Symmetry: T
Subunit: 150 residues, 12 copies
Amino acid sequence: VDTKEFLNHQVANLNVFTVKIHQIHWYMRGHNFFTLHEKMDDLYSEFGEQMDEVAERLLAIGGSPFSTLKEFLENASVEEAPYTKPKTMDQLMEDLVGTLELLRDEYKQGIELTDKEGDDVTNDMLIAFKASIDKHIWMFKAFLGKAPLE
Amino acid sequence: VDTKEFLNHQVANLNVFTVKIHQIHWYMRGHNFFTLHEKMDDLYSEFGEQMDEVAERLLAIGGSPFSTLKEFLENASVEEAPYTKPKTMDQLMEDLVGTLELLRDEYKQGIELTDKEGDDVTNDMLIAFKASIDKHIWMFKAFLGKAPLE
Amino acid sequence: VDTKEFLNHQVANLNVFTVKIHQIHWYMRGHNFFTLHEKMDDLYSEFGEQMDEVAERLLAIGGSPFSTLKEFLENASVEEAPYTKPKTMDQLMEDLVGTLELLRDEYKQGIELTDKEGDDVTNDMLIAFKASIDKHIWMFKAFLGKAPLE
Amino acid sequence: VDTKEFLNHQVANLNVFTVKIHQIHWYMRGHNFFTLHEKMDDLYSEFGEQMDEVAERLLAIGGSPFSTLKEFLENASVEEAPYTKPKTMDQLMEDLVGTLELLRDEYKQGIELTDKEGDDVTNDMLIAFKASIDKHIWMFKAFLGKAPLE
Amino acid sequence: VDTKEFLNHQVANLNVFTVKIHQIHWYMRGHNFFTLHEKMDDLYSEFGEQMDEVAERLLAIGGSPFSTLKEFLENASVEEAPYTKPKTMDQLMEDLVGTLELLRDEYKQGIELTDKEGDDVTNDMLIAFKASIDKHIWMFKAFLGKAPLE
Amino acid sequence: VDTKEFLNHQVANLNVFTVKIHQIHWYMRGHNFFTLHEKMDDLYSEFGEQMDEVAERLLAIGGSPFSTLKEFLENASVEEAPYTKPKTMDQLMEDLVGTLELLRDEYKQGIELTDKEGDDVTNDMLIAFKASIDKHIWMFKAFLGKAPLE
Amino acid sequence: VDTKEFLNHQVANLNVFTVKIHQIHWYMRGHNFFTLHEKMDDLYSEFGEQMDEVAERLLAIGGSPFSTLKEFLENASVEEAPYTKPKTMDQLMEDLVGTLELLRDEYKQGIELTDKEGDDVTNDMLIAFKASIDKHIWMFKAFLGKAPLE
Amino acid sequence: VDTKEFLNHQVANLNVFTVKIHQIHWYMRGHNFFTLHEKMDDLYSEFGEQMDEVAERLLAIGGSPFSTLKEFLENASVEEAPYTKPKTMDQLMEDLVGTLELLRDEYKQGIELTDKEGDDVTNDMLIAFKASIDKHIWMFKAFLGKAPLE
Amino acid sequence: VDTKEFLNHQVANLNVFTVKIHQIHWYMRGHNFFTLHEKMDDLYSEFGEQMDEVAERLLAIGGSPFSTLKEFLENASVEEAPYTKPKTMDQLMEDLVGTLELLRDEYKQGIELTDKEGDDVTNDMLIAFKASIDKHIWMFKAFLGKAPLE
Amino acid sequence: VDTKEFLNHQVANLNVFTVKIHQIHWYMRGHNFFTLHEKMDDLYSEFGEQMDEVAERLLAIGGSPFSTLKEFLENASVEEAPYTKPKTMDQLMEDLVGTLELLRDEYKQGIELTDKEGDDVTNDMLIAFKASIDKHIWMFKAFLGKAPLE
Amino acid sequence: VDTKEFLNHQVANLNVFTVKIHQIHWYMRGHNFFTLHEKMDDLYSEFGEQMDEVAERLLAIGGSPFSTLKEFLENASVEEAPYTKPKTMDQLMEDLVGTLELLRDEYKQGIELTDKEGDDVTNDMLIAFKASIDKHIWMFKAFLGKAPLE
Amino acid sequence: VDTKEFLNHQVANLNVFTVKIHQIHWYMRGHNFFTLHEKMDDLYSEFGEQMDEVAERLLAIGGSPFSTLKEFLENASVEEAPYTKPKTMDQLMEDLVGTLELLRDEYKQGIELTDKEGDDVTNDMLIAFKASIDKHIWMFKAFLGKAPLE
Ligand SMILES: [Fe+3]
Ligand SMILES: [Fe+3]
Ligand SMILES: [Fe+3]
Ligand SMILES: [Fe+3]
Ligand SMILES: [Fe+3]
Ligand SMILES: [Fe+3]
Ligand SMILES: [Fe+3]
Ligand SMILES: [Fe+3]
Ligand SMILES: [Fe+3]
Ligand SMILES: [Fe+3]
Ligand SMILES: [Fe+3]
Ligand SMILES: [Fe+3]
């Protein structure tokens, strides 16, 4: 792939992720409800901004962002699933953390690609998002009792 | 129908509308770009909050909100379409207004349904979101040079 | 009358009331000057906002608000009179209170009217305005040494 | 039986509830201490404001609120009890929720009453308080690992 | 004439202008709706403060402001007209600017008169209001495509 | 007694006092209504804070605060009484002041006791609350036309 | 006089006035205590700033402000007197008003003198302080039941 | 002496100190102008508040604060002198610090006294103001190149 | 050229661009006046800050920024021209966009250069500014009805 | 000359002054660096606003402001010079003050000119700007150890 | 010992405590991660402030605070240990609580120490920190499921 | 070495630098006391945040930060020394700058290292810290009268 394609792919991913954050936020139950319920609100807003920025950066480089659920569904690498069976807090966090891991890894690809193609601006955006993802990964893993790269 | 079904249907609608708002805002062009670009950010946040509140009111009455793009696409009455052909700001606003008119009319049904079933709380929520939609409809129509209900 | 006419009649009353608030505010004298001087500023802003909201709700339901002193003068049920003879703080308060009671009473009609006509949004607006007027009526009557409905 | 009586009964209830929230707040222990400790502070202020509003709405419709612990004790339907045995976070939350459910249910009666009696303003206040109680009920039940209408 | 008469004449003018601002604000339609709708709100507040100031300055020099729509209508030099025939945005702004021009010019007379009279305080007030009017006039004319003194 | 007993006795007093403050706030009438009505809101919050702090200081030194209206009623030295007869603003303030003087005097004992006993921290708290009470006592007496120490 | 001398005379006056404001602020008693007590705090700050500004303006035009109580006492035209026999709220306000009047009249002289001397800057300062004093004079008079120039 | 006398004595000193601070503030020159000019504004406000607090504490304990420059001059231990000769920033600071040392030492007496007298509240006030003075003394000394107790 | 030279060249450009932004800001006319007038204010401040940061980064790497209009005029690559003829909002916008495009392109060189030189800090500054210019370029093009890369 | 010409001349002056403030800000060294570095940031913003205001006042009276560095250079009376040989803090401040003195003096002219011409508004602007310049002149002079008019 | 020695010993302790707070903050894991992670940030800041205040109070009484890790390590009574083995949230909290009890107990000594020495200021300092420590000890113990005094 | 090692080494350096900043802050004396005293508080906060970020970054890449003074002392390259003899402000600043220079140079290494290994996130962090260090280096050097790279 090329930058435009990489970027649009993230537009799709980010839209799926965001809905996933909402699912966790609405369905969670357990002693950590209060704290994690608010934390999801924070994630939602943060990833919603990554999303608009990625989309806007694409537009700025002459691209055209996907902009319908159908397109997002067709393009995303992030997986989603309806909430049927109830799920443990940890189960939900594990799904959150997994998606973060996916985004971290894809961003890594975009980062190197962008660097090789000499799109310095997109490169730096991706880096900054990664930085954050990494910190979240460390935090959600500690919540789950695990080491970050564990 | 029933309140729970009504509300869930709106969670689906709201998620489609919200992406539609982003589409407009990303793709718009013309002399009204700056002002309308920002207006869409406002709409996005507002509808996004209506969405969270409808979902949370459903949860509170014992329901289970849809929570994946697939479910939203499967259940929404709001229509969406990929942005292929360039459209006019007015064309874009006309799409927005149409969707607002759809929501208005559906809420009106929810308003009576919820009334008929005696759920005073859900009833008042819908009324307050309706009040806002009506004001937006007046403003967007004025933007387009039209009377609100014309 | 119908919703549109009721609302426009209130646009007229609200514009008269607002000027009346300024009158008291400018002409008042007595030991309570400071406090009441400030309270009127607050009433003025609140009533001015009800007024804009009533007019915008009208506009939203397809109406056309009166918008000239002459029309307000011609349609208001609220009475006004030039300040000639000096008047006491209590006399001023009594005028204020009476106007409040008129608004209350008229709002109550609009409330029945809109309930019967099914305009849930306007119904709620008026109810919220009434809620406030009732509270002011209690407070100004208490200032005057009276019971609210007494 | 009547709105005034209904309202005053809630002034009593609200006073008992508020002290119960402090009890929880003071005596809780457990891993959820920090979070729930602060959440109680928020409940305390919120119910304290409901209380002042109900009492002020009462005064405004010509009533006279109870205003001594003795009166509150004599009229409350909300139950209280000295903290002797050390209870569980969950036990404390279960008392809190139980009380919320009681308020919910009684407000529902008041809604209905006020509705039959024509007091639109009091009707709307109660509805809004209900909306909030319902949300809390959803949240505290999630905390306890239960569904709201559990 | 005299300062007192001048000032009171402005209280009348200011009140008619303020209502005229609301008319434009309520009835405007066209692509500039968003922006101008908000700009009128700003004008409304500004002129409403000039109004209270003028009236309070009059009161301070021992005068008695007019304080009824009737008085305002009887003394205003500013003209008003019911909105019957739907007007262009430009037509509305042209009415605004014309009124601004009228206030400018009358203030100029009050500055002279006040000057001659030796009421330094009133003189400075009027100057400061004129400074603002002049800036508006430049802005609204630019909006209309014209030079300020054009 | 002992610090712990002293402290819990204040929790009881503080709870009665706070309800008394609401009584005054609700039932007051007269020309000083607006000002005193808000002053009471301030007293309510302040004393409400002294109360949580005394209780928490108790908890911190190993004590167990009373936490039910029944307990408060059984232990308070502050007196309360249903509002039956209409009373004077001065009468109300005189009740307020009398209660402040009681608290002042009891804290004085606590301040003494507490120092006997070596509890520096509790000593300092009480001193700071006293400082405040003393100031209120000066102001309310001035309001009443009296010197502070009567 | 001469601008420098005039300004330094006001540094003196302003210092006396400011302490007078504290006197009233400290010794007042009566039903208007809360309100006037706070108003005096407001006056104190304002006049304290006029003071600093006058002194700094003098410094800026090459002068040297008085800067000791002794110099203030020796130069002030504003009169002060120890509080021995108690006074009424009205008596205190009357003293306040009288001093305001004195400052108004002296500023008027400085306004002329500063004008005669071409010190446009000092001229404008004085006018702005005069505007405020005039307003205060109207308000305190209204508090006293009098017309401003009465 | 007695607490009342001690307190009043400080009202006098504080008033002379405050003017002194202005003096330094107005007349200073040198490279440290901007910084010290602003620091004096801070000291002015701070001591001004100590002053009002001392006075009000006096009032609260049944005293009567001095409240005229004449009284202040008559009772102060703090020394003042017109600014004739050019002084140094260091000279000015040295005067400031000296005055600070005086207040510190006198508070120390007020402190022992209040202790002995059992006026816990006054005692604590003084200790807090002392704390602040001590810090200032440390900082101004450091500015001057000296150790604090140097 | 080298980092220092590149930076200094940008201090000159930035200074010319900033005055160009004020020219547009002052001279524009047309229906988009209010909105573009304000947007120019935003650009002015933003570019103004890039400028001070570029200058300060130069100073930090041991350079010496140009600091007179003469030097700016002598070194700038950005073109300026007196406003003689009345241009269209579009013409003005086009001039703005073309300058943005020039800055974009030159920053790109500096990015590369700063890179070849291994000045990581400067490299990142430039990238960040570029990111913003790119966004601006997208927005003003959209305003003009064009795609970003033309 | 005439108002327009005077104003435009100031546009040119103000533009040179603003760049000179940056030069000082950038090149300054010495113990006063932190404080003066920040003061210049304040001067830069202030004068930059005077500049925009002068320009907009010109536009408002029918003028056309210079708007290119070339025109600024061709019309300014304020002198600039490239920084080659280092210069003391004092030398820098001396340059600053000299320029302030020039603006002070020219404004004085404009002040009288505009008075001659009857442009009250422009006249008041200039006066207010002059008031600020005078105070700065006092402060910078004090910093340099001199009297304001020395 | 003496107050200066006592204080300095606290400087060392406070610095060790602070680092330990970070250790906990960085290494914690488990479901309470979010909440405790933030809580540690708060303690870090609070204790860091006590630290500077103790140091500055020492400097103010003529002392010389330790100011190097070496000194802190040499003087502290608080114990620290590298995080090797994996610890429980509870274990971590237990370590925190233990250190808090140590500080509490040492402050108690400093309280008596400064009291016999008659340093009222230092005495009050310590008291206020103690107050806070005691509250924290209650909270962390409840978190651990324990009563405060163990 | 490797990123982990590098980062941990900075954790150690940052903690030593932070304590050094407090030393300077506490011990400085001279005319610049006020300004630099505050500047160090700024540096202390800044560096304390760099420190927490570095540590969290480490943790996030799977590392384990040093977390005891002992470890810091053992690993830091930043030197520290007890304050025995009085030193000049300049001497203090020179120690500060030297440390800044050290961190700058070490970060440059980290920058290189982090890049060879391609840890883009850590690389950008270091770059951003460097940017700030460089600026501080330019400013403290100017303060010392030197050029940044000397
Ligand atoms: Fe966006
Ligand atoms: Fe939510
Ligand atoms: Fe509006
Ligand atoms: Fe209330
Ligand atoms: Fe007013
Ligand atoms: Fe609490
Ligand atoms: Fe000052
Ligand atoms: Fe006071
Ligand atoms: Fe700068
Ligand atoms: Fe502008
Ligand atoms: Fe400090
Ligand atoms: Fe952290």
